[PDB]
Design an enzyme around this catalytic site. Structure first.
Site, PDB file in Angstrom:
ATOM      1  CB  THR A  27      14.203 -12.542 -66.894  1.00 24.73           C
ATOM      2  OG1 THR A  27      13.720 -12.148 -68.064  1.00 24.73           O
ATOM      3  CG2 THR A  27      14.330 -11.285 -66.148  1.00 24.73           C
ATOM      4  CG  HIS A 174       8.683 -13.448 -74.352  1.00 18.51           C
ATOM      5  ND1 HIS A 174       7.631 -14.607 -74.246  1.00 18.51           N
ATOM      6  CD2 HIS A 174       9.080 -13.253 -73.280  1.00 18.51           C
ATOM      7  CE1 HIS A 174       7.925 -15.076 -73.191  1.00 18.51           C
ATOM      8  NE2 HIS A 174       8.832 -14.275 -72.481  1.00 18.51           N
ATOM      9  CG  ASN A 177       6.976 -18.097 -70.542  1.00 19.38           C
ATOM     10  OD1 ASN A 177       6.491 -19.397 -71.054  1.00 19.38           O
ATOM     11  ND2 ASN A 177       8.231 -18.018 -70.696  1.00 19.38           N
ATOM     12  CE1 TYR A 179       5.859 -11.528 -68.165  1.00 21.63           C
ATOM     13  CE2 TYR A 179       6.753 -13.424 -69.226  1.00 21.63           C
ATOM     14  CZ  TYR A 179       6.669 -12.450 -68.193  1.00 21.63           C
ATOM     15  OH  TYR A 179       7.595 -12.729 -67.042  1.00 21.63           O
ATOM     16  CG  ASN A 234       1.960 -14.037 -63.994  1.00 25.96           C
ATOM     17  OD1 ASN A 234       1.709 -14.173 -62.795  1.00 25.96           O
ATOM     18  ND2 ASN A 234       3.498 -13.671 -64.379  1.00 25.96           N
TER      19      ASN A 234
HETATM   20  C1  LIG Z   1      15.781 -17.327 -64.047  1.00 22.44           C
HETATM   21  C2  LIG Z   1      14.937 -17.641 -65.032  1.00 22.44           C
HETATM   22  C3  LIG Z   1      14.529 -16.558 -66.049  1.00 22.44           C
HETATM   23  C4  LIG Z   1      13.636 -16.980 -66.950  1.00 22.44           C
HETATM   24  C5  LIG Z   1      13.324 -18.120 -67.513  1.00 22.44           C
HETATM   25  C6  LIG Z   1      13.595 -19.187 -66.661  1.00 22.44           C
HETATM   26  C7  LIG Z   1      14.453 -18.957 -65.511  1.00 22.44           C
HETATM   27  C8  LIG Z   1      14.651 -20.420 -64.926  1.00 22.44           C
HETATM   28  N1  LIG Z   1      12.701 -18.406 -68.790  1.00 22.44           N
HETATM   29  C9  LIG Z   1      11.905 -19.922 -68.925  1.00 22.44           C
HETATM   30  C10 LIG Z   1      13.307 -20.498 -69.818  1.00 22.44           C
HETATM   31  O1  LIG Z   1      13.488 -20.168 -71.053  1.00 22.44           O
HETATM   32  C11 LIG Z   1      12.956 -21.876 -69.859  1.00 22.44           C
HETATM   33  O2  LIG Z   1      11.823 -22.108 -70.506  1.00 22.44           O
HETATM   34  C12 LIG Z   1      12.771 -22.638 -68.514  1.00 22.44           C
HETATM   35  O3  LIG Z   1      13.952 -22.289 -67.727  1.00 22.44           O
HETATM   36  C13 LIG Z   1      12.563 -24.233 -68.818  1.00 22.44           C
HETATM   37  O4  LIG Z   1      13.986 -24.847 -69.399  1.00 22.44           O
HETATM   38  P1  LIG Z   1      15.109 -25.589 -68.720  1.00 22.44           P
HETATM   39  O5  LIG Z   1      14.335 -26.686 -67.725  1.00 22.44           O
HETATM   40  O6  LIG Z   1      15.549 -24.408 -67.563  1.00 22.44           O
HETATM   41  O7  LIG Z   1      16.125 -25.881 -69.307  1.00 22.44           O
HETATM   42  C14 LIG Z   1      12.302 -17.383 -69.474  1.00 22.44           C
HETATM   43  N2  LIG Z   1      11.636 -17.592 -70.488  1.00 22.44           N
HETATM   44  C15 LIG Z   1      11.492 -16.699 -71.580  1.00 22.44           C
HETATM   45  O8  LIG Z   1      10.863 -16.807 -72.669  1.00 22.44           O
HETATM   46  N3  LIG Z   1      12.168 -15.401 -71.455  1.00 22.44           N
HETATM   47  C16 LIG Z   1      12.684 -15.155 -70.323  1.00 22.44           C
HETATM   48  O9  LIG Z   1      13.347 -13.919 -69.966  1.00 22.44           O
HETATM   49  C17 LIG Z   1      12.829 -16.036 -69.312  1.00 22.44           C
HETATM   50  N4  LIG Z   1      13.407 -15.777 -68.070  1.00 22.44           N
END
Ligand SMILES: Cc1cc2c(cc1C)N(C[C@H](O)[C@H](O)[C@H](O)COP(=O)(O)O)c1[nH]c(=O)[nH]c(=O)c1N2
Ligand SMILES: CCCCCCCCCCCCCCCCCC
Length: 347
Positions: A27, A174, A177, A179, A234
Site C-alpha cells: 500500500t 487479501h 493481515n 482485514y 489489528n
Molecule cells: C509500506 C507497506 C505497505 C504494505 C505492506 C508493507 C509495507 C512496508 N504489506 C506487507 C508486505 O507485503 C510484506 O508482507 C512485508 O513488507 C514484509 O516483507 P519485507 O520484509 O518487506 O520483504 C502489505 N501486505 C499486503 O498484503 N497488502 C498491502 O497492501 C501491504 N501494504
C-alpha cells in the site's frame, strides 16, 4: 549464490514466471481522488517488471472497504481504465502482475465513504485510529448479516471480473493481515453464532465462498490467496485459531490455487500457537505452491527455497528502496536498506 531465485517457475498451465522473485503487495496511498491509479503509479510498477510476478498494492472492491487515504479501487470503469494502463505497461516491460483484492472490514473508516457503516463479522472494534491521518478513530463495526455477506461475495467476484477486463494476469485475494477475510478466520474478530462462526468449517466459510466465487469467474490458475495464520496486525491472538487453519488449508488445496502467500513482516518469528514460524506451519499443512515473505534477504530466501520451506519469495521493503532489486541481486550489487522515510516518495 542465489542462482535458484532465477529459476523459471511454472505456476500452472496458464502462467509461467521468469524467476521466483515476487514484488510483495505494498500500500502506497498515491491513487487519485477517484481512487484511480495514476500515471506515476504506472511508471512505479513498470520499472519493477523484472520481477517474476508483481502483486499490486491492496485494491478495494467497493467504497466501504476504504480504510486509508488514496488507496486504489477496481469497482468503477475509470478505475478499470487506470489499471489497464498499469498492466499494459508491466506487460510491455516483460512482466506479469496480479491485483490484490481488498476489503478492510472493521479496519475501514467512514471518513472515506460518506459516514456509512463499517462492516465486520462481529461488533468488535479495534484500538486506535487510522495511521497518518488526523484523528480518525476506529469505530465499532456492524456485524454483517447473511445478506451483507452475499453482497460482499458478489462484489469480490465482480471485482475479479473487472481485474480481467483491466488486463491483470490474476488476483491475489487479501485474506491476511487482519482485514475482512482474516477477520472471519480469527476468534478475536469473529464471535458469530451463525453458519459463519463458531466452528472451523463455519469460520472458514466466508473465505472459501469468496475463493470459490472468484474461481468461478476467472479460473483457479489466476487466483491466489494471502493468509495470516499468526495474529499480529489489528488482531489479538487466540489459541483456538490454529484449528481453523488446520481445517482451511486442506480445503484450499482442493481448489488448486495459483499460490498461497503468507502475510507476515518477519518470518523468522516463531508463533507459539503455530508451533513455529508461519511459513513452516503452512508448509506442514499445505502441499502446493507457497510464497514466503518477511525480512528475507536474497541469500536467506534462496536457502529457504533450496531447503523446500517454500517455492517463491515475495520482497517488499527492499523493492521500495531498490526499484532495480532484481538486477542488483542478479549482479551482486549493493542494496540500499529500506527506511520509512522512503514512503513519502513514489520511485
Ligand atoms: C509500506 C507497506 C505497505 C504494505 C505492506 C508493507 C509495507 C512496508 N504489506 C506487507 C508486505 O507485503 C510484506 O508482507 C512485508 O513488507 C514484509 O516483507 P519485507 O520484509 O518487506 O520483504 C502489505 N501486505 C499486503 O498484503 N497488502 C498491502 O497492501 C501491504 N501494504
Ligand atoms: C502495513 C503497512 C506498513 C505498516 C507499518 C507499521 C507496521 C505494521 C506491521 C507490524 C509488524 C509487527 C507486529 C507485532 C506483532 C505482535 C504479535 C507477534
Amino acid at each position: 549464490s542465489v542462482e535458484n531465485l532465477f529459476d523459471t517457475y511454472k505456476l500452472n498451465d496458464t502462467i509461467t514466471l521468469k524467476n521466483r522473485i515476487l514484488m510483495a503487495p505494498l500500500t502506497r496511498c498515491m491513487a487519485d481522488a477517484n481512487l484511480v491509479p495514476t500515471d506515476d503509479m504506472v511508471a512505479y510498477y513498470a520499472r519493477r517488471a523484472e520481477a517474476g510476478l508483481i502483486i499490486s498494492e491492496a485494491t478495494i472492491i467497493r467504497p466501504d472497504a476504504q480504510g486509508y487515504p488514496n488507496t486504489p479501487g477496481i469497482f468503477t470503469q475509470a478505475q478499470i481504465a487506470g489499471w489497464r494502463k498499469v498492466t499494459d505497461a508491466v506487460h510491455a516491460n516483460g512482466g506479469k502482475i496480479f491485483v490484490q483484492l481488498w476489503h478492510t472490514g472493521r479496519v475501514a473508516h467512514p471518513h472515506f465513504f460518506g459516514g456509512g457503516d463499517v462492516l465486520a463479522p462481529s461488533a468488535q472494534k479495534i484500538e486506535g485510529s487510522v495511521p497518518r491521518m488526523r484523528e480518525l478513530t476506529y469505530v465499532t463495526p456492524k456485524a454483517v448479516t447473511v445478506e451483507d455477506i452475499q453482497g460482499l461475495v458478489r462484489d469480490y467476484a465482480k471485482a475479479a471480473e473487472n481485474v480481467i477486463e483491466a488486463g491483470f494476469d490474476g488476483v491475489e485475494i487479501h485474506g491476511a493481515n487482519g482485514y475482512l477475510i482474516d477477520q472471519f478466520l480469527h476468534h478475536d474478530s469473529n464471535r458469530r453464532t451463525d453458519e459463519y462462526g463458531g466452528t472451523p468449517v463455519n469460520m472458514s466459510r466466508f473465505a472459501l465462498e469468496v475463493v470459490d466465487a472468484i474461481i468461478a469467474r476467472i479460473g483457479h490458475d489466476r487466483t491466489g490467496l494471502r493468509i495470516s495464520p499468526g495474529a499480529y496486525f489489528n488482531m489479538a491472538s487466540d489459541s483456538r485459531d490454529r484449528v481453523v487453519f488446520d481445517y482451511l488449508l486442506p480445503e484450499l488445496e482442493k481448489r488448486d490455487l495459483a499460490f498461497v502467500h503468507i502475510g507476515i513482516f518477519d518470518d523468522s518469528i516463531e508463533f507459539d500457537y503455530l508451533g513455529g514460524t508461519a511459513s513452516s506451519y503452512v508448509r506442514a499443512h499445505y502441499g502446493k505452491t507457497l510464497v514466503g515473505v518477511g525480512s528475507y534477504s536474497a541469500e536467506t530466501a534462496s536457502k529457504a527455497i533450496a531447503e523446500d520451506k517454500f517455492d517463491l519469495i515475495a520482497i517488499g521493503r527492499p523493492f521500495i528502496a531498490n526499484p532495480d532489486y532484481v538486477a542488483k541481486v542478479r549482479n551482486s550489487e549493493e542494496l540500499v536498506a529500506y527506511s520509512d522515510e522512503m514512503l513519502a516518495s513514489l520511485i
